[PDB]
Amino acid sequence: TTTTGESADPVTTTVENYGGETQVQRRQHTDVTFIMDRFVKIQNLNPTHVIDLMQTHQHGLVGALLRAATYYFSDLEIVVRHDGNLTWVPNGAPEAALSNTGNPTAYLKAPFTRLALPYTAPHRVLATVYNGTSKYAQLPASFNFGAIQATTIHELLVRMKRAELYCPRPLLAVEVSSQDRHKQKIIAPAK
Amino acid sequence: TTTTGESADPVTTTVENYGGETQVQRRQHTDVTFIMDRFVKIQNLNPTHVIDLMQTHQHGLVGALLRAATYYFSDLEIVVRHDGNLTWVPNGAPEAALSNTGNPTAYLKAPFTRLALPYTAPHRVLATVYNGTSKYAQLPASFNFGAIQATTIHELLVRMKRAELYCPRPLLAVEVSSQDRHKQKIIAPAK
Amino acid sequence: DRILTTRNGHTTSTTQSSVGVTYGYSTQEDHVSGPNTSGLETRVVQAERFFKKHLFDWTPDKAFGHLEKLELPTDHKGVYGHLVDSFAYMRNGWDVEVSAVGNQFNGGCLLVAMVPEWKEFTPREKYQLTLFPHQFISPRTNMTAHIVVPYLGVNRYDQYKKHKPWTLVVMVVSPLTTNTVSAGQIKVYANIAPTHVHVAGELPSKE
Amino acid sequence: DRILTTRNGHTTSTTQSSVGVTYGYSTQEDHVSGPNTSGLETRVVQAERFFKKHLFDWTPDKAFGHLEKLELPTDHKGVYGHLVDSFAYMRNGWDVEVSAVGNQFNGGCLLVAMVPEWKEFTPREKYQLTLFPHQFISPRTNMTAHIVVPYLGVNRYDQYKKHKPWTLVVMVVSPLTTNTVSAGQIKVYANIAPTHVHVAGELPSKE
Amino acid sequence: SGNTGSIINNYYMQQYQNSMDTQLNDWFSKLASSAFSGLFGALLA
Amino acid sequence: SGNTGSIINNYYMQQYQNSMDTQLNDWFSKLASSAFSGLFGALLA
Amino acid sequence: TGSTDSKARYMVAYVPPGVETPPDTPEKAAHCIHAEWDTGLNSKFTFSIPYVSAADYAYTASDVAETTNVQGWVCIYQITHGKAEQDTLVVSVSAGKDFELRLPIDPRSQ
Lengths: 191, 191, 207, 207, 45, 45, 110
Fold this sequence. Notes:
The PDB classes it as virus. This is part of a larger assembly, with two copies of chain A (about 190 residues), two copies of chain C (about 210 residues), two copies of chain E (about 45 residues) and one copy of chain G (about 110 residues). By secondary structure, chain A is mostly beta strands. Chain A is about 5% helix and about 30% strand. Chain A has a single domain (about 1-190), classed as Jelly Rolls. Chain A is globular and about 70 Å long. Chains in contact: A-B, A-C, A-D, A-E, A-G, B-C, B-F, B-G, C-D, C-F, C-G, D-E, D-G, E-F. β1 (about 5-10) of chain D pairs parallel with β1 of chain E, so a sheet runs across the interface.
């Protein structure tokens, strides 16, 4: 295909131009809701922890794809391994509320607690980057999914439910120095 | 029945030729999908293990029947007894991926973990023998059902689901030296 | 009807001692246009014709189990061979005729078989080579065996310099016997034609 | 419409400075199946694709009449070339693109012609090369000439190792002129595709 | 919707399982679908 | 299909339980069915 | 991106696996699937790299053991140019209509 490149209009040429035949494609695995819908680790934890998806690892499957969007929306599931009872409070609650039973509190049941939580931010969508300040770099404090507290929080997994992503941003593979290809050990049978 | 043996056309004579009567036969137990559909041991294990059906024992019920086919297809179930969490990655994944939670990871639940896995090879069918090389004897590295990893893998059972076999190959019973029959202790009541 | 004429391109073969044609695994080919060649494959009928190869000399001293094999494709100095060097991927089936000309006073028997994914068979496995597409050649009855097989393999197209899906196998079932009026040995030849030849991925010239 | 894309097999050529396509002597081929091949000819579409050749460097010092030629077929290291060695007889037409890339600040003019049965032309005859299928390349207007010709000759099929019916000719009509903003020389290339390739009379292998 | 494959309904009502959206659109799908294909000019195939 | 005997459906959808086949045949059954039986010649029974 | 007075003619070829090294000249590469184009009013040319392989899918990653690339090469040549010495050809890539990715994995070091 020949065109005006400067206009930046999408152009998708096919193998038919030189006699080939375009095949059928099945893209379920790159569907946004599907791909974000799996548990990933949060990692930097404390007994009092504010749920912030930006604490996912930046190169992890979910963390990288999330950072490759400017705005997003989703509900959430969490799996928490903790000592003591686990309390959760919604976005906007005073940190002091984490000490009370009247807020959703899960009594310990081995091996860990799994819960479904709704989006509770006061904004219509959240952002992974925010160009400005929120007080009268970092993200506004209101970008969170609430907070949890237990005597000890050993592990925390989060899962984005019914995710929506808006305005794509750069997503990078590892840099290559080999001058030809990034090579690594791909799994193969023994002996 | 009398025929031209050289042509090698199938000929199935019956007892009717001399006055007998052919009976009803029920062959469900020799149905291919049915017979391959049971768990068998894998045996040579490591904390990082690539699932390769050719690691079944060559004289085991499943291992021998599998080797008596040239090509095959199937989905899979596995039972794994392991320490730590178990992670599985599909055919083609970098071995390094086994360390991450974003890949199907099963948290330990005694006594072991049972999972259903889909066929994930890039080929339409796999082979038990391959006459050639795959690099630019052994089987191409791409003939596998993914890999698993845990701190320790104590035991691994595999089960072929909806198996399909193509192009029969030799299947041998034990060799006999007795000159008449292979004899062995068949189970019989005590005293 | 013992007299058969087979035609492949501008080449023919006529035999008056045949016992028919054996089709192995199928009587037709899988689809030759799948997703892996993106519609860029083409057929080359000029390659679909007979080429020849001497396999071995069947002599009275070769015992049961003596096995001779020919992996396919083999070195080809004609059109088919040039395709292997000019295209990255190919697929084709085989039309195979094996002849063993002695006379009717010879006795004995040869098993002629086409084997997918060859591997060296142990002596015990040789008792089961009839599981593969085959015919027998027995001097009292025929001098020719004829087998037709389709392309097969884990991949829809192949790189024959790296993998050979089919192997022609000839095995002595009962040793060649001789008389005062029989031939003393029988030279065994193959007359082979590739079928439904398709290529994809034209390569650069070497110079 | 100055933008033209030509496709021959799995090869394409796109030009944004063309002045159309000139058809020489005919817009179709004579019959490819006549009595001289007894119905044994076949078509080889894998040979019908573009191959490349540098013709010469057009520099300011070459005067009117300077002539460069390329007899066809020429040495070919691809599929078409193998056909010349594997079959006794062949026939094909030609789809010819000649490009002369300088810039629009160059002046001058090249005559591009296809000549049947080449013979060295005398200087006076050069004034009449426009009797043959041709186009001009003049930097102020186009960088590409495009000519399509059918197979022809006293014989319906030919032995290209003994006779070359067509010759591509490029002749300087007006010398290349240069400025401070123009290119200093123009390299002239040919992008050629054989068309309607038919072969007959398969040859033995050399080994 | 997403990575879930239970053939059977959810034991809990939707008003509990998820947040509920209120009202007062696939841009990239439109953008990709709108892409030019084929050539431009005149073909001599 | 195979060695399974639950009278009741599977709790999970098929797209999850197994891989899904796509399209672009029992040779040995045909081969065995085609076998000659009886005799050959002339019977005197 | 050259100026109006700079012209060039380019060629792109898809070289499948099967040769030791990529062709170094347009003439050797002409026998491959390829496209040639010249510069003019339309500054952009797009070409589809076809999926041609033995298996129906290919691995996205590359193994330490594979020396020459399993899927072949793309070679870009300049046939010739006129006054285009400092002028450039910007190259970008996008997914084709039937491009497909399957089997999600989480491979980076974390």
